[PDB]
Every structure is written in C-alpha cells, then in structure tokens.
Design a protein around this ligand. Structure first.
Ligand SMILES: C=CC1=C(C)C(Cc2[nH]c(Cc3[nH]c(CC4=NC(=O)[C@H](C)[C@H]4C=C)c(C)c3CCC(=O)O)c(CCC(=O)O)c2C)=NC1=O
Ligand code: NA
Ligand code: NA
Length: 184
C-alpha cells in the first residue's frame, strides 16, 4: 500500500488499473485509457484543477477502505451473494467482486479528474455488459454500486459528494438498464 498527494500518484494508479484490467476491458478500452492518461498529463503540463485532483486523491488513497466498507454493506443487505449458490460465495468470486469494486472506483476517479463521464461511457458500459455475460441477472447486483457510492461519498463533504455523486448515479442507471434489458 502507498498513498501520496501528488499528480504522479494518480497517474500511477491509472497505469496500475490499465495494466490490471487490460485483459478484462479489451483492447479498445486500453487504447481509450492510454489516450486519456496522455491527455491528462498533457493538460497537467498547463496546470490542473486542484479541487478535482484533491477529491480524486482522497478517493484513490482510500480505495481499499471504500471497497471493504461497500462489500460489507452489500453482504449484509444481501447475504445470498456470499451464501452457497451465490455469485460471491467462492473465495475467488468474492475477490473478483472486490477487484471490480476497486476498478469501478478508478473509473469514478477518472471521471472526477476529467469532469466528464466519458470514461464511464466508453469503458464502464462495455464492462457492465461483459460482466453480465459472465454473471447473469442477479437482483442483488443493483445494490452493489449503491454501497460503493454510500461508501465513497461518506468520505467527502456535501460539495465534494455533490461533485462525485453524478458518476455513481450514471453507473447505477446503466447497470439497471443492462440488468432488466439484458435478455431482450
Ligand atoms: C458485487 C458484485 C460483483 C462481483 C461478485 C464480481 C466478481 C466477478 N467478476 C467477473 C468477471 C468480470 N468483471 C468485470 C467488470 C470489470 N472489468 C473491467 O475491465 C472493468 C474495469 C471492471 C468493471 C468496470 C468484467 C468486464 C468481467 C468479465 C470477465 C473478466 O473479468 O475479464 C466474474 C465472472 C467470473 C467468471 O465466470 O469467469 C465474477 C464472479 N464483480 C462485481 O462487480
Ligand atoms: Na446470488
Ligand atoms: Na460461488
């Protein structure tokens, strides 16, 4: 573990995310992420919005705390996810859940620093589709992102929370549409 208050910390977090999720998100997603990272550094050369970078660093440095808190809330609100026959019953499966939780948070942070939902439109939506192709329609999944949102915004003030909430809402709405319109 390591946390810093520097733009290089966010850059390294994005690189690690790209490296870890490259095989899962596909080649088009990695190209988008690489282009995003290059543009962020190019615009950082001309100065960066400190408020956005502050909220991004605050969410990145507490990534694992947010993941654990959200996962605990989700298991409590839907114990069937970790019970026999559930999607997160297996140790590997539960580990994959926490992985995707951290990746959702990385995507949120990418939108934060960019002030745009682009990274969620391109990468996020596609992955939400692939993820449902491997998991199926599990109703408890709808609370998954809510817990993450509840666990992320709980570390921010009302202004920072208001700046970050729209991306969680966009993700929840997208998953809802994918969930109830998959087999159609
Ligand atoms: C709390 C709900 C969640 C759980 C239980 C999981 C675990 C999980 N991920 C997956 C697979 C999975 N996850 C995801 C999501 C993520 N991929 C990305 O690139 C994004 C960054 C990230 C979300 C944005 C995808 C696309 C896939 C498809 C297969 C793969 O992991 O590459 C499975 C299916 C295992 C299998 O049959 O091979 C499971 C069980 N991920 C959750 O979000
Ligand atoms: Na289940
Ligand atoms: Na299982």
């Amino acid at each position: 573990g390591r946390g810093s208050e520097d733009f290089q910390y966010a850059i390294d977090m994005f690189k690690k995310f790209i490296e870890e999720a490259a095989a899962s998100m596909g080649p088009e997603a990695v190209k988008y992420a690489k282009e995003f990272l290059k543009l962020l550094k190019e615009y950082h050369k001309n100065g960066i919005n400190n408020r956005l970078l502050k909220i991004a660093l605050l969410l990145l440095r507490n990534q694992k705390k947010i993941v654990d808190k959200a996962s605990q809330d989700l298991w409590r609100r839907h114990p069937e996810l970790i019970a026999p026959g559930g999607i997160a019953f297996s140790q590997r499966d539960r580990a994959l859940c926490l992985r995707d939780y951290g990746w959702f948070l990385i995507l949120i942070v990418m939108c934060l620093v960019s002030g745009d939902k682009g990274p969620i439109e391109k990468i996020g939506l596609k992955c939400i589709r692939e993820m449902y192709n491997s998991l199926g329609v599990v109703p408890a999944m709808m609370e998954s992102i809510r817990c993450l949102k509840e666990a992320s915004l709980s570390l921010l003030d009302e202004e920072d929370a208001n700046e970050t909430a729209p991306y969680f809402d966009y993700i929840i709405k997208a998953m809802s549409l994918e969930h109830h319109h998959h087999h159609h």
